Amino acid sequence: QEIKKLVDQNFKPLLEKYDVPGMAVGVIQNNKKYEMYYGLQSVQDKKAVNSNTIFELGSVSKLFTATAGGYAKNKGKISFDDTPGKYWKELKNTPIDQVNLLQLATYTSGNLALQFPDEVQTDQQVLTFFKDWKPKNPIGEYRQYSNPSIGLFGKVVALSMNKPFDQVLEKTIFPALGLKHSYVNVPKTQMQNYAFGYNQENQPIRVNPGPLDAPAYGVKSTLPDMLSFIHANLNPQKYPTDIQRAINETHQGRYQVNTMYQALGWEEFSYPATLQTLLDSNSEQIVMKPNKVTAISKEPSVKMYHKTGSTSGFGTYVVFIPKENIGLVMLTNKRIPNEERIKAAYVVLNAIK
């Protein structure tokens, strides 16, 4: 009743403030979905954002990679104590076959940065990168937010399931989540629904191919689909047994970096959380530098979870709180500062609770 008015108060000004052509905000509360749409999926085409608009999720893709890993661990196909060598035959007995599937997933190999270097691109020279991989920091002790790390994990998960990564998500994970319009590759019959992203010059753009892009930042979805994914995270008991387990796996905190608990993809906090706690989670320091991990001391009673994502032309934020049975999704076709994403959501979900 007030939900639409709250989103209007808190999300709608951001379109003018950052010259964002288009935005989709979804709220799910007590199993009722609310969708709110603003502006255009394509400026040049004057095509409006609607329930069919496909946006790039950026690193919110990692939540799908994490979920696919939980599914594989609960079908017996993998173990999070394993190392890559067990699956990627060409890496076995190399120094990367010393780091385990969990550590890759949660960014602790000691020696992986946010990107593969630009020169790495083909299937052949990704293999060579990890062959010549040599340690630096103490395996398992330092959190380094990393596309190569989680990418490796996804590629491994795919190996364990026999099928390439793109097929794991589209033939296995997305259907098991009831998602009808989420893709690693947008088919031809859906290109008309794929938004333009818009860069900082407001030029229209879409995501560039890169090494192990699919598992790290390569998923595209709609607002109804993302609201179903949040529904699943809030109420997994209803889903097939194996995806229930996969989902519960993604909620288990593994370590803390001060006040952010790292789960499989999801960031976890004690609920209620202060706004500032939610922001610090995505600081330069956490995001860009290595940081020393600490074991979980206070196991939070009531937990919330979040994740940001960005491609060059798109912004995503996703948040849910199990015990309040509430969640939010924001999708945009121009990046806005992570902090503005996190803050508007804070004010809406509080105002409703």
Which residues bind to ligand A0Y, rule: CB under 6 A? 58-59, 114, 147, 207-208, 210, 217, 287, 308-312
Beta carbon of residue 301, minimum distance to ligand A0Y (angstroms, whole number): 28
DSSP summary character for residue 90: G
As to burial, measured by CB atoms within 10 angstroms (0-12 exposed, 13-18 middle, 19+ buried), residue 296 is: middle
Measured from the CB atom, is 142 or 198 closer to ligand A0Y? 198
Among candidates 330, 62, 336, 45, which has minimal Cα distance to 199? 336
Q: Which is nearer to ligand A0Y, 287 or 302 (CB)?
A: 287
Q: Which is nearer to ligand A0Y, 48 or 287 (CB)?
A: 287
Q: Which of 42, 59, 109, 221 is catalytic?
A: 59
- CA pair distance 42, 57, nearest whole angstrom: 17
Query: What are the helix (H) ranges across the chain?
Result: 3-10, 13-18, 61-74, 101-105, 123-131, 147-161, 165-167, 174-176, 213-217, 223-234, 241-250, 275-280, 284-288, 338-352
**Nearer Cβ to ligand A0Y (242/339):** 339
- The nearer residue to ligand A0Y, 233 or 310, going by C-beta atoms, is 310
Residue 29 C-beta: closest distance to ligand A0Y, Å: 25
Residue 290's nearest CA partner among 103, 59, 105, 108 is: 108
Pairwise CA distance, residues 327 & 348, whole Å: 10
Residue nearest to ligand A0Y (CB): 59
Smallest distance from ligand A0Y to CB 121, Å: 13
Tokens standing for 52?
């069919």
59 carries an active-site annotation: yes
Provide, rounded to whole angstroms, the least separation between the CB of residue 309 and ligand A0Y: 4
Shortest distance in whole angstroms from residue 214 CB to ligand A0Y: 12
To ligand A0Y, the closest distance from the beta carbon of 139 in angstroms equals: 23
Q: 108 vs 281, which CB is nearer to ligand A0Y?
A: 281
The span from the CA of 204 to the CA of 346, in Å, is 30
Catalytic residue among 87, 145, 305, 346: 145
- Helix 61-74 / helix 147-161 crossing angle, nearest 10 deg: 40
| Cis geometry, peptide bond prior to residue 272 (ω within 30 degrees of 0) | yes
Amino acid at 81: D
Q: Which residue numbers are catalytic?
A: 59, 145
